[PDB]
Amino acid sequence: KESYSVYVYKVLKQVHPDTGISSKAMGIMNSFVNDIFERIAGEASRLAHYNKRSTITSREIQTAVRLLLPGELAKHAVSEGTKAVTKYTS
Template sequence: MPPKISGKAAKKAGKVQKNISKSDKKKKRMSKAMSIMNSFVHDIYKRIAAETSRLAHYNKKLTITSREIQTAVRLLLPGELAKHAVSEGTKAVTKYTSSDDHNNMKGGKRLFSEPENV
């Protein structure tokens, strides 16, 4: 015969179950929100890449530079949002180039050697 559960214990168990189900609902909501944001970022990235490629092609350039990317962002994003995006992008590139990561170092050796002057 299973032990009897007192009224307080049953009440606590009910509250715990209710909190767990609230937590599950919150996790599902957050997961859905993250999925939507991921789709949004992926879509914007694809649009910027396509526009950047078009700009390079129009200008008969084989290399995509930060200039083409900035122009694509300015064309695709409205007003103030474009200004902030370009500003943050420039800041990120500056931070990266001032770090050691941009030297392509691995185990103390460069992965790509500098071209030799002949």
């Protein structure tokens, strides 16, 4: 059905123009994206329920990212998320 193969390939072609990817490595990257999506979404859901909020917003996603990703990974992901949100809302 659905997968992230197209978007993983776009990011690959933009980060490594001449490197391809096998069908097994794509299955692994789809599993990776699904895993991390479910982790961030579950942590955001718990944050919303902890604070008696009935909506998941950008701040809950940011706090979930801070709780989950380690060290500088969290800092750079938070910076990228903020940049995307202020580019979208502009």
